[PDB]
Amino acid sequence: VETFAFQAEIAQLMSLIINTFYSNKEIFLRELISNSSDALDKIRYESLTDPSKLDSGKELHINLIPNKQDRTLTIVDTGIGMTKADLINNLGTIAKSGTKAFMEALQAGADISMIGQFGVGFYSAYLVAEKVTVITKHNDDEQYAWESSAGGSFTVRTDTGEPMGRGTKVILHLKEDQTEYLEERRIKEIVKKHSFIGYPITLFVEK
Ligand SMILES: CC1(C)CC(=O)c2c(C(F)(F)F)nn(-c3ccc(C(N)=O)c(N[C@H]4CC[C@H](O)CC4)c3)c2C1
Description:
The chain is 33% helix and 23% strand. With 207 residues, the chain is an alpha+beta fold. The protein has a single domain (1-207), classed as 2-Layer Sandwich (Heat Shock Protein 90). Strands 1-6-5-4-7-3-2-8 form an 8-stranded mixed β-sheet. It is globular. The ligand CC1(C)CC(=O)c2c(C(F)(F)F)nn(-c3ccc(C(N)=O)c(N[C@H]4CC[C@H](O)CC4)c3)c2C1 binds next to helix 2 and helix 3. Belongs to the heat shock protein 90 family. ATP binds at residues 35, 77, 96, 122.
């Protein structure tokens, strides 16, 4: 397990997200599904010039897995996935200007629902989650686990767990007052209302 500090802009944004009383928290789901849709568009796109990129799985979909007992909502996709360098530094590098601009927009009176327009929609997870775990597998690398409960640090380790084939699992460890997002009728209504997604989105209903 390696521990890293977030870039200053991103730690400032996470501190603002984690601590905000911003009522419209439901936007987190459309943001995470949009990340999944962009990852599915990328792997589909790359497969048109190199069909072997789909040897790790041909199905292109999104799964929504609420878990009341564990207080977790998992977002699973079979997109391009992320490499070790994407998790530690490369996605954060591209996100730097977007993060700073989003915060300037918020200072100028803008709404937290604009987060996606700045390319940093992933961090909207912290509106409802006290900790986020990211399990990911890209074709050019090993399976990795990324994790952060904010507070300025994140960890990256090789994932010894169940092999994924290719894609990303975003595990939201929900805050005590945000358990409504584990309810089947709530997920359904949010997916219908806010969710632009040219891939099947399947809600796993709890037995
Ligand atoms: C690395 C992170 C842990 C922390 C981070 O900063 C961050 C950001 C960023 F804010 F930078 F935009 N976005 N982001 C994220 C989260 C899920 C996914 C998905 N579900 O695959 C994703 N896919 C990108 C991967 C690159 C491809 O070109 C396009 C599809 C990106 C994360 C996850």
